[PDB]
Amino acid sequence: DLRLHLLLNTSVTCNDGSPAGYYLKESRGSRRWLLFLEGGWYCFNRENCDSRYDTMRRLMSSRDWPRTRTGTGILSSQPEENPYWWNANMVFIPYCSSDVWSGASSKSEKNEYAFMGALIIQEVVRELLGRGLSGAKVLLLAGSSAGGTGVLLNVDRVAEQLEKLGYPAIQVRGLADSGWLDNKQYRHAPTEAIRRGIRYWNGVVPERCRRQFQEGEEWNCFFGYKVYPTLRSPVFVVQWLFDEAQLTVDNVHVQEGLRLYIQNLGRELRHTLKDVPASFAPACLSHEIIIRSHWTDVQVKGTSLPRALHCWDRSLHPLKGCPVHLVDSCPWPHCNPSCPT
Numbered sequence: 001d002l003r004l005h006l007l008l009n010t011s012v013t014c015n016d017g018s019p020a021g022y023y024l025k026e027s028r029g030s031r032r033w034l035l036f037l038e039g040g041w042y043c044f045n046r047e048n049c050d051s052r053y054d055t056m057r058r059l060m061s062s063r064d065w066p067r068t069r070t071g072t073g074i075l076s077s078q079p080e081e082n083p084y085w086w087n088a089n090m091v092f093i094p095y096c097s098s099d100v101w102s103g104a105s106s107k108s109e110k111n112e113y114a115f116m117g118a119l120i121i122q123e124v125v126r127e128l129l130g131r132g133l134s135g136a137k138v139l140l141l142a143g144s145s146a147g148g149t150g151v152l153l154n155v156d157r158v159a160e161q162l163e164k165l166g167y168p169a170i171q172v173r174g175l176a177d178s179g180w181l182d183n184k185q186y187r188h189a190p191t192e193a194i195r196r197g198i199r200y201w202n203g204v205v206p207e208r209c210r211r212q213f214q215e216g217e218e219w220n221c222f223f224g225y226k227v228y229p230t231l232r233s234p235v236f237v238v239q240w241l242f243d244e245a246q247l248t249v250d251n252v253h254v255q256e257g258l259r260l261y262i263q264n265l266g267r268e269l270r271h272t273l274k275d276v277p278a279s280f281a282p283a284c285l286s287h288e289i290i291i292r293s294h295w296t297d298v299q300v301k302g303t304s305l306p307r308a309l310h311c312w313d314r315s316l317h318p319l320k321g322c323p324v325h326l327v328d329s330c331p332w333p334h335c336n337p338s339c340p341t
């Protein structure tokens with residue numbers, strides 16, 4: 001169990017103005033810290049956010065949060081469930097800002113909701129330095145789905161924040177799960193929601209990416225294959241080749257037209273990962289993995305995800321029999337026998 005702490009700075013809030021927070025389980029014999037960003041889509045105007053507040057309120061408010069959560073997958077403290085970092089300090093940061101962790105706007109007389117995702121991450125980091133983070137050797141910022149995209153948008157800002165606060169020894173790294181294409185749909189734009197959303201959230205993107213695409217075009221930096229090349233921090237990318245959220249937005253739910261569509265989608269995703277040295281991309285139809293309890297089951301070319309992350313740690317001290325770049329080449333969902341059921 002990880003125990004809830006509401007932010008001491010009550011001006012950093014969820015959508016409805018309630019305090020944001022984090023769940024923490026300390027491991028005093030470890031100098032490794034895992035900060036995990038939750039996912040869960042987003043909302044991009046008043047009417048769409050009002051609907052989310054009726055039936056997804058825990059993703060917009062802390063008023064009903066439980067005092068504990070069970071750590072699972074990479075957040076589990078059992079060696080059998082988590083071969084990678086079972087002894088780390090564990091942090092789960094709930095997603096209550098509906099802004100893909102990009103926002104920096106407070107509730108006010110002209111804003112019905114606050115969108116503070118980028119500031120929530122910084123304040124969590126700030127308050128953890130008083131509870132042990134000051135002695136860390138590695139800070140791994142991880143996340144799934146919208147939280148995976150949030151890793152890509154925030155990992156270099158966390159690095160910069162610790163540098164400016166006087167902590168040069170903490171190595172900041174990223175792990176982005178299921179947050180990696182602005183492709184043509186199979187049937188008939190989803191990118192327009194992101195464009196409109198950034199403007200609604202006062203959303204912020206990494207500076208080098210901002211400078212490449214310039215004003216009005218920051219939505220491009222929400223797409224992994226465009227923002228990843230601008231990042232300095234080491235980032236490991238986990239992405240199913242046939243991601244279910246990607247297929248949903250593409251309006252896919254088999255004859256030749258769809259067969260070619262699906263095969264091209266896998267081809268394109270594999271192409272964008274060619275020059276990503278730390279990555280894990282199985283040929284499966286699925287979504288998310290790193291906090292699922294059976295995340296140890298899937299393998300690419302005989303290597304599990306916990307093993308690949310361990311090999312990544314070793315590389316940041318090619319390695320013999322301990323690979324870090326693992327991308328399926330077979331071209332159809334579940335041609336990898338270890339895919340989830």
Ligand SMILES: NNC(=O)c1ccccc1OCc1ccccc1
Binds near residue numbers: 191246
């Ligand atoms: N669940 N998905 C997210 O959170 C997300 C995060 C970053 C960028 C877009 C996202 O979805 C919208 C979308 C997905 C695929 C193609 C176009 C648009």
Ligand SMILES: *[C@@H]1O[C@H](CO)[C@@H](O)[C@H](O)[C@H]1NC(C)=O
Binds near residue numbers: 009011012119
């Ligand atoms: C509280 O957070 C707000 C919003 O980020 C910031 O303006 C302010 O400096 C913070 N207060 C303190 C005491 O750090």
